[PDB]
């Protein structure tokens, strides 16, 4: 019936002055735009069909053509920024917001989807959707005593669209918009559907990706324990954003970092720091690096939880980007830790994997490692045991690495090179 229409036939039916002919042509456009391989979005745009689709959104007496045109516009808006802009330029934003209150749930859901694609394009369209007033009717769709009574796909779509309203910086979303959305986000973060949980965590990860004032808005909602619980989920689509959110929070103040430790997050990191998925291991080590940049009592928690052997592990063997994060964790540890804590680090075997990474070509990781070596020597000075550390470094080939590094191309590495040899290797 409406399968495999040409764009020319779609235009002919939509321009026909016959509502039923228009409906059949709009459904044909929807099916074209819903095929798997290369939907002809630009062809549909170039035919000038977007204004007619937008006008069809307002035909209350023919809900099928509202649905079909909403679906068609949703899939155009799913494309490039240009293609999303064409949908916005046709006036679709207020028309879709009007459809959020439709009595037909499948039309309301289509409008939710369309607004998620538009807001998802970037901060400008995100903020434009907010200025048109989308947040109030979106949140009203979730104003039920128990989310479990909502259709599963309906709830997943609303969660995803709400997360796109929280997404992107330069600029971050308006503060009042974030405050209005957060209580619903907290409710969705306690729902029992894995996809809702994943997109709820992504939303929280967006809101915590910013300055400490943005992190505080989230932490003050009391969500850190739930985030730590989701840190231990079996589903990788949940662990990934949960870890991102936790890692974002520990870039804030020592007090915000303490909430993460208080909630029991460190107990999950034996698993995370050995996780077979490279990205989880990398972001878990990044998170560890920002915790070891904290107070000495927070470094002590890392010690108590047995996590220093795991840092030695990732330093000894991991993806290089993970090893670079491990080097940062070590340098931050040695920069803020006590003499005892630094001594414990050497006793766990940090020296040899540290020296082995001095063969890397990433100039920054060499600077990071050389800083850590200096910090450990400074602790060994307070104990008078610098000669013991010098023996450790030369016995594992580290001296040969530093003594060949004074001729490096970067100069802050050559200065750090020679300074270590003049003081401790002569």
């Amino acid at each position: 019936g409406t399968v495999n229409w040409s764009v020319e036939d779609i235009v002919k039916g939509i321009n026909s002055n016959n509502l039923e002919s228009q409906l059949q042509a709009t459904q044909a456009a929807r099916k074209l735009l819903s095929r798997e391989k290369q939907p002809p979005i630009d062809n549909i745009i170039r035919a000038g069909l977007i204004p007619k689709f937008v006008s069809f959104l307002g035909k209350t007496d023919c809900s099928p053509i509202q649905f079909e045109s909403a679906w068609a516009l949703t899939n155009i808006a799913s494309g490039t920024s240009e293609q999303t802009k064409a949908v916005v330029d046709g006036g679709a934003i207020p028309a879709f917001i009007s459809l959020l209150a439709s009595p037909h749930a499948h039309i309301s859901e289509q409008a939710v989807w369309a607004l998620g694609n538009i807001a998802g394009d970037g901060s400008a369209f995100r903020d434009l959707v907010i200025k048109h007033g989308a947040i109030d009717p979106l949140l009203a769709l979730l104003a039920v005593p128990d989310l479990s009574t909502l259709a599963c796909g309906y709830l997943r779509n609303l969660t995803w669209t709400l997360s796109n309203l929280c997404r992107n910086k330069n600029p971050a979303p308006p503060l009042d918009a974030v405050e209005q959305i957060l209580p619903t986000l907290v409710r969705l973060l306690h729902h029992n559907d894995p996809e809702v949980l994943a997109d709820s965590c992504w939303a929280i990860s967006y809101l915590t990706d910013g300055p400490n004032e943005r992190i505080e808005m989230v932490v003050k909602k009391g969500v850190v324990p739930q985030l730590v619980k989701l840190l231990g989920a079996t589903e990788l689509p949940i662990v990934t954003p949960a870890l991102r959110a936790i890692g974002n929070i520990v870039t804030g103040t020592d007090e915000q970092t303490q909430k993460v430790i208080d909630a029991g997050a460190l107990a999950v990191f034996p698993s995370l720091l050995t996780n077979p998925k490279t990205n989880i291991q990398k972001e878990a080590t990044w998170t560890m690096s920002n915790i070891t940049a904290g107070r000495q009592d927070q470094i002590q928690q890392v010690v108590n939880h047995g996590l220093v052997p795991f840092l030695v592990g990732v330093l000894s063997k991991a993806d290089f980007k993970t090893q670079k994060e491990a080097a940062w964790a070590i340098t931050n540890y040695t920069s803020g830790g006590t003499v005892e804590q630094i001594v414990y680090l050497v006793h766990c075997g940090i020296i040899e994997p540290l020296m082995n990474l001095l063969s890397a070509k990433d100039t920054k990781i060499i600077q990071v490692i050389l800083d850590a070596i200096s910090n450990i020597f400074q602790a060994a000075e307070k104990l008078g045991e610098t000669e013991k550390l010098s023996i450790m470094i030369e016995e594992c080939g580290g001296l040969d690495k530093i003594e060949a590094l004074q001729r490096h191309e970067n100069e802050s590495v050559t200065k750090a090179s020679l300074n270590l040899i003049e003081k401790y290797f002569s």
Binding site: D209, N248, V250, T251, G252, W286, S289, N290, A293, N332
Partner: peptide
């Protein structure tokens, strides 16, 4: 010395 994402 925190490092952002």
């Amino acid at each position: 010395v925190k490092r952002r994402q």
